[PDB]
Amino acid sequence: AQYEDGKQYTTLEKPVAGAPQVLEFFSFFCPHCYQFEEVLHISDNVKKKLPEGVKMTKYHVNFMGGDLGKDLTQAWAVAMALGVEDKVTVPLFEGVQKTQTIRSASDIRDVFINAGIKGEEYDAAWNSFVVKSLVAQQEKAAADVQLRGVPAMFVNGKYQLNPQGMDTSNMDVFVQQYADTVKYLSEK
Template sequence: MVLHGKVIKLLITILMVGLSSAAYSKDYQAGKNFTVIHSTVKQPPPLVEFFSFYCGPCYAFAERINVDTAIRKRLPDDMKLEKYHVSQMGPLGPALTEAWAVAQYAGVDGKVEKLLFEGLQVKRDIKTAADIVMVFNQLGITSEKYAEMQSNFMVKALIARQDNLVEK
C-alpha cells in the first residue's frame, strides 16, 4: 500500500515536469503571440518629490541631509527630479505653492527654497503672503516683477500641475 502511494507520487511528479517543460519549449512568434514595439522611450518621466515648507522632515532632507543632491547624482542623465509643493499644509500653503512655481519659473528655486524653509522653520518670520514676496525681494526680484510672474500662464500651469498631482 505504501509502495503504491510512492509510485503514484512519482508518476504525478514526472507528469508535472513533462507538462511544464512543454510549456517552456513552445515557440512564440512575433505578430502572433506578441507584438514588437519598434519605438523607444524618448525621455523617461521625471521623478517627482512632494514636499511642504511647513514640513520639518522636508526641511531636514533639503537643508541638512541634502537628499535631493544624492538623488540627482544617482539619476540617469536623461531623467530629472521635479519638486512639487503641497498646498494643503499650513495657512500659507497655496501662497507657498504659488511662490514655488514663481521661483521655478524665474530659475531661483534653489535660493528661494533655502530662504523659505529658514523663514518658516527656523526664524519663523514668514507669516503672510507679503512676507513671501519679501523673500524674492532679497534675491533682487521686485514686488512688481513677482506680481507679473504670478499672472504668467506658465506659472499658473505649474501651480495647476502641482495641485493635480498632489490630489492623485
C-alpha cells in the same frame, strides 16, 4: 531580495501614466522636509546618482499651513517659472520654520526681493497664467498619487520611496541608501 516592495519602497496600486521620472513633493511647513533640504540634501544626492537623461521634478503641496500653504504653492510656481529655486528654497524654509518671519504673502515676497528678484518681475509672475497652470500641475501631480504626507518621492509614477524602512543611525548612510534606492527603482 535586497530591495523589497514594502521595505525601501512601496508600489502604487494605481499607477500614474505619463508621470515625471523622479517626482518629489514637499511643504515649507514640513519638518522632515526641512531636514531633507538643509541637513540631508536628498534631492542633490539623488541627482548625483541618477542615470543620464533622467529629469527631476519637485512640487509644493497645499495640505499644510492652510492659507499660507497655498500661497507657498503659488510662490513655488513663481520660483519654477523664473528658475530661482536654488535662491529661495533655503530662506523660505528658514522663514517658515526657523525665524518664523513668514506670516503672509507679503513676507514670502520679501524673501524673493532679498534674493534679488525684482518686485515688478515677481508680481508679474505671481499674477500670470503661466504660474496659474504651474500651480495646476503641482496640484494634479499630488492628486494623482493620493498624497496625504510629505516628504514624498515617486519614481516613474509607480514606486514610492519608503524612508521609514532605512537606518537613521547615521545621516550619511541614510542619504546614500535613499539615493541608491531611487537609482534601483529608476533602472527597474
